[PDB]
Amino acid sequence: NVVITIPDKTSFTFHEAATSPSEGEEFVVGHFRELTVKISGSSTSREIKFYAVDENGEKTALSGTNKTDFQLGSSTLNTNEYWDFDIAGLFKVMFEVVSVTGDVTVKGIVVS
Amino acid sequence: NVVITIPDKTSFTFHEAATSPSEGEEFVVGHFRELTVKISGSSTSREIKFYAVDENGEKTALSGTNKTDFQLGSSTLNTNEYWDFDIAGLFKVMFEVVSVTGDVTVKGIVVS
Amino acid sequence: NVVITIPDKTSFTFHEAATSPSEGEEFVVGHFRELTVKISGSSTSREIKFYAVDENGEKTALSGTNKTDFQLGSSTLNTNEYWDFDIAGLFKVMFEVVSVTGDVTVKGIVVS
Amino acid sequence: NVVITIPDKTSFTFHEAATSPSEGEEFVVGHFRELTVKISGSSTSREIKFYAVDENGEKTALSGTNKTDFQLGSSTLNTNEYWDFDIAGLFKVMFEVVSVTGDVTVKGIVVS
Amino acid sequence: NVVITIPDKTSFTFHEAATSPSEGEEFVVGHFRELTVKISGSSTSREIKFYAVDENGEKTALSGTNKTDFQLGSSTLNTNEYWDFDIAGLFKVMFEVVSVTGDVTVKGIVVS
């Protein structure tokens, strides 16, 4: 029995147009394996910190890979970036806006 | 229950025989995970820039891997090359012909 | 025949609030491929050693990847960390509390 | 609904007992993802060049990984070697015997 | 149509209690992708060489990754070690006991 395999995917908004600091919305990983976050908006400065969160709400800095230059990091000071993360073994993920001047949007696509 | 698994694949033409600068056709990623782009044609010079595009049309430089030498890059000045990309968490991808003297074809095979 | 594929996942507690040295509970890998361990609690100091265990009970130091900084290691002196392991070819895994001052929890999520 | 997943595999002969230069047979990749080539025989010298080939017949040097030493390359002067390739995004692959003294066999196993 | 995916696994004994030099038993890869070999026993010295074997019985040194320290190698002088191999494109694999004083067991778990 041969089957053609495709992943499940969904979208999630962590921040829809943050203009002040916030932890934003937390994604429950469920059955997904990978996350790509897009950082967008018209800010002139910002800092986003990337976090894994467990069932008790403890936050742990989470490294991912920048799709522009393959750099590794657990935060960014830039906008117009995609960051890839391996999330399969995590309960929840969170993308904190530490600081922003203007507006920053943080949205993800998750893949099983 | 044991199943033999195979990927879904399709072909996509970004540029059929570009002779002038163009963003070309955008590929909506859908359920796919990986893309291999072939840059072909007959040219003296050409420049192809690789982009991810979000739902608002923002373009982000996208790095891939050259199958000939495993070099990383988000653009190329060469023809007769395959470039591999991880696209699973992206909305769309675009391969811009910034310039061509002669003609350049840009075609992909996508894999789930 | 097209199928959407998702992994199996489960959770496992190696140590539910260790305050003295212990090997803790051993996880039978079964059909799983990957493990992510979270080291948590309010301990002021601890040492966790990571082990693969075979069917005869022989323990072998097992390296994994720290999700905060991508560092490799077979042990840690830190709390609030995730460690990723490729376990597909192992019979059992074990996370030994070698030492602790305070309480340390060791819990994993496994993925097929 | 839980399924046990296994790949499709097949074998392909690029060269059965080449004693003079030849492009040999081309493999149409179809639904396969990976290729491992064995270079065998009693030749005393040879040069094999590894190619991806598109729908127009353009040949592109294709790097793979030597399973003995993890070296990368797009050709070999050696015999008794396995080379692994990621082929999922390619139309065809070809292994050219550029030169040979004696007999060289080039056979692959492909995996979905 | 959504399915939860798990691998096929199997076990294989290359050597059950080798006390003198032997090539041991050959595993036919079949539909499997990844192999983890455990080297165990009470030997005080030993040398194990790792091989791929083709349909004609030709042996090729095969590199794998030590799970304790991520070191690469095609042989070992140590006991109490796991070695991981990518075997998907191989016909057969063999683990030769070149020498041993005492007993060495060589067993694998294989994953699709």
Author numbering:
A (entry chain B), B (entry chain C), C (entry chain A), D (entry chain D), E (entry chain E): 7 to 118
Give the original sentences from the paper that presented this experimental model:
The putative lysins XepA and YomS align very well, with a sequence identity of 38% (54% similarity) covering 85% of the overall sequence. Both the XepA and YomS monomeric β-sandwiches adopt a fold resembling the C2 domain, which usually contains about 110 amino acids and 2–3 Ca2+ ions. In summary, we show that XepA initiates cell death in vivo, whereas YomS has no effect.
However, YomS corresponds to the C-terminal half of XepA.
